[PDB]
Design a protein around this ligand. Structure first.
Ligand SMILES: CC(/C=C/C=C(C)/C=C/C=C(C)/C=C/[C@H](CCC(C)(C)O)C(C)(C)O)=C\C=C\C=C(C)\C=C\C=C(C)\C=C\C=C(C)\C=C\[C@H](CCC(C)(C)O)C(C)(C)O
Ligand SMILES: CC(/C=C/C=C(C)/C=C/C=C(C)/C=C/[C@H](CCC(C)(C)O)C(C)(C)O)=C\C=C\C=C(C)\C=C\C=C(C)\C=C\C=C(C)\C=C\[C@H](CCC(C)(C)O)C(C)(C)O
Ligand SMILES: CCCCCCCCCO[C@@H]1O[C@H](CO)[C@@H](O)[C@H](O)[C@H]1O
Ligand SMILES: CCCCCCCCCO[C@@H]1O[C@H](CO)[C@@H](O)[C@H](O)[C@H]1O
Ligand SMILES: CCCCCCCCCO[C@@H]1O[C@H](CO)[C@@H](O)[C@H](O)[C@H]1O
Ligand SMILES: CCCCCCCCCO[C@@H]1O[C@H](CO)[C@@H](O)[C@H](O)[C@H]1O
Ligand SMILES: *C/C=C(C)/C=C/C=C(C)/C=C/C1=C(C)CCCC1(C)C
Ligand SMILES: *C/C=C(C)/C=C/C=C(C)/C=C/C1=C(C)CCCC1(C)C
Ligand SMILES: *C/C=C(C)/C=C/C=C(C)/C=C/C1=C(C)CCCC1(C)C
Lengths: 261, 260, 260
């Protein structure tokens, strides 16, 4: 019964929710412009690959956040028995609707952007194709099983089982970042910048499953609006500032990563 | 709740709609047969890569069009206030239903076929991996944001914002075709044939956002039936004749494109 | 009206259906741990690429089967006129509901796992990029048109048309497996292991379109519960035992697949 328009209007009229969404559409757009400008002098094909992969992060982000803001990738789901958000109401259109406003579109943002973050980092670290393939495939599995968890309403236990599977995939990604590429970067001559970006990425990425657990999808100590801002704040650092820092290094060290595709 | 059968029946009984879909299903099938025949002499792995990528175009087209013809990838959507198609109704089953018959399945056709056209062109021009990656990623973003625009019913302005984002992605693809690959093709020794396929692709591709703006998705000067035929006509040229021209060149110049 | 919980409960409380799903979740899970353990000694990057691609098979399987078991990837569809399952009922929850419980989630299991099976096999056979690309693309087309067939309710004949398209794509994959990779494997020095894996794959894969035609999706001689177990039994072989065999060889011939 809930229409896209009703959800679009619910987001508007809800200061927290509206701001957490529209601020990122704005920051993503500005980031694209800034990043394109910064990388204008790049000529080496390998350097340009790192640049495009990084720039695709805010491109995916602006489109995906528009998906949420428009109401296209938002749904109202009723949580299963025992879920801390069970029996919640939302007030849409004009009546009280059972369920929780679920911004599942965020998982699309993650599924399409995290592979680009990983591609950029792997290339920076001088990774071989095997580790890149492993990091990217498990990263995608992580995001998709996370979406499945959020979309599951049949059983409370099932939701957390998906969450556990997602975490396991996340561990694969963390192992590659912390152990494999950490060492590869030394041979690539990007040890300093990779270690910094590696640590920044690990710290911020760890925040997502924590927010999931604490937010409306998990134990719900954080209401819908606050869960959204938690994710948007993480996104601002894990995507935009992260990309700005990587591009800052790249544009001053093209020769170091020049090599060959 | 409109059924898949009701939309399938709607396509039928509606001349322009039925013809625009089934004629492309038929042409796609015939194209695949012809292309397979045309390329049985190929032996070079690189020449064969270009050939398979090209043949995948009509393969995606026949499956995707069947998705539309069957009603599977069609939905009825109610446009937002201010949209020229808002207030429209359609006869489905035994009742009048509010909304517009939306052939969103066409976006699946484009999202799966355009990357193959780009891959064939890039390989032909001797493009490096970075440019191929750039062209294909932005091409997919263009098709997906285009689909998002067609699926947005909450706000008229939002629909056009998606449209703008999609256009920006399109500009990236255009730049690579017109500037980068045009130059790369000279080193690959395929400057002439690339020039022909490039001109064809750029002109035809530019037609899609125009049809979008004029059709039911946009200001609706073109009814659902004319919108479909407009897109179908473009597909015939951008897909089938494009593929023929490329394959006709490939089968006579296998030596030129042969490589790593 | 049918909720996710109702389909979730339908699977549970139905010994046949529940066993066919939850058993594969367990086998997939145990397989991942077993394979990771078995390959812990690999050092060569090419060998590791084959191992990870193979390991992703049970990874996709455990996630996909959970999608089915949870009810997330299951729907209730009413078959079209003429379909042998037309006018069927099921009793979702405690009410008699028209249609057939359709576990379309299986197609996601296939579309995501088969490419990994093919990439592993192709690499083992020392396939060039062209054949890998050809096999994988037509394999995905096969899975997606198969899904389209299962999801089509507008026409009985349309379902079989999709089926035909999917079969045509399957033939392409079979040709690469049986003719081309069989030859490549010789030059790669993996002829004997490939022969074993090739036979197992061709035989098991042939079973799916057979189960489709015989099950509720096709002529419906096999009820929903038996159709599920038929696919599950095939999965156990085409995925888990196939993976064990490939990995057992891989870890014993790391040097051969490395090259230099
Ligand atoms: C929303 C918004 C703007 C969106 C703009 C977009 C999406 C344009 C992106 C362009 C790119 C990525 C171009 C590629 C170049 C490289 C390409 C190549 C060398 C292959 O031609 C380079 C050097 C990186 O700029 C504004 C408000
Ligand atoms: C949910 C669950 C289990 C999850 C377990 C997972 C996801 C384990 C993944 C392990 C990987 C990917 C190991 C990588 C190695 C190669 C490492 C590398 C190339 C990256 O250095 C190799 C040699 C292939 O085992 C069970 C129930
Ligand atoms: C910066 C991103 C650009 C997207 C801008 C989308 C916001 C458009 C909001 O429009 C307004 O919405 C109200 C509630 O639906 C209507 O009552 C009103 O008549 C309409 O004018
Ligand atoms: C690392 C994460 C830890 C996972 C924690 C998951 C525990 C939630 C279990 O759900 C509960 O299970 C009961 C028995 O099945 C149901 O009766 C009840 O209604 C349901 O709400
Ligand atoms: C990493 C985060 C850990 C997740 C912890 C989630 C545990 C959920 C506990 O909920 C409770 O479970 C009981 C059954 O055990 C129900 O009877 C009760 O009604 C329900 O409210
Ligand atoms: C390997 C992990 C797989 C997860 C399996 C989840 C099983 C949890 C079943 O819970 C029960 O489901 C019934 C029907 O919905 C409820 O009536 C009952 O109250 C609830 O306790
Ligand atoms: C731009 C977005 C970024 C960098 C997103 C990162 C997301 C994750 C690391 C998400 C991880 C999750 C789990 C490990 C468990 C289940 C839920 C998720 C999806 C939040
Ligand atoms: C076989 C199909 C082809 C070649 C399709 C091409 C499609 C495009 C070039 C579409 C472009 C669009 C925009 C630039 C703006 C928004 C709407 C679209 C999706 C029609
Ligand atoms: C792990 C799953 C595997 C190996 C699945 C293999 C599936 C196929 C070979 C399916 C083939 C089909 C056809 C050829 C015709 C139409 C229906 C299908 C999808 C069942």
């Amino acid at each position: 019964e809930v229409t896209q328009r009703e959800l679009f209007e619910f987001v508007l009229n809800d200061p927290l929710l509206a701001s957490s969404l529209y601020i990122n559409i704005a920051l993503a757009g500005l980031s694209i412009l800034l990043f394109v400008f910064m990388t204008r002098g790049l000529d080496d094909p390998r350097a340009k690959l790192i640049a495009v992969s990084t720039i695709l992060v805010p491109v995916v982000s602006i489109a995906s956040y528009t998906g949420l803001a428009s109401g296209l990738t938002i749904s109202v789901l009723e949580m299963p028995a025992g879920h801390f958000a069970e029996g919640s109401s939302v007030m849409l259109g004009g009546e009280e609707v059972d369920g929780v406003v679920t911004m599942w579109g965020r998982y699309l943002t993650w599924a399409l952007s995290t592979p680009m973050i990983l591609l950029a980092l792997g290339l920076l670290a001088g990774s071989n194709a095997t580790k890149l393939f492993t990091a990217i495939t498990f990263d995608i599995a992580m995001c998709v099983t996370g979406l499945a968890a959020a979309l599951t309403t049949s059983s409370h236990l099932m939701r957390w089982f998906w969450y556990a599977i997602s975490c396991a995939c996340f561990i694969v990604v963390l192992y590659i970042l912390l152990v494999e590429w950490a060492q590869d970067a030394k041979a690539a001559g990007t040890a300093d910048i990779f270690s910094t970006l590696k640590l920044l990425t690990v710290v911020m990425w760890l925040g997502y499953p924590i927010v999931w657990a604490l937010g409306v999808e998990g134990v719900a100590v954080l209401p819908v609006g606050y869960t959204s801002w938690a994710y948007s704040a993480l996104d601002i650092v894990a995507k935009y500032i992260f990309a700005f820092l990587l591009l800052n290094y790249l544009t001053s060290n093209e020769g170091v990563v020049s090599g060959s595709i």
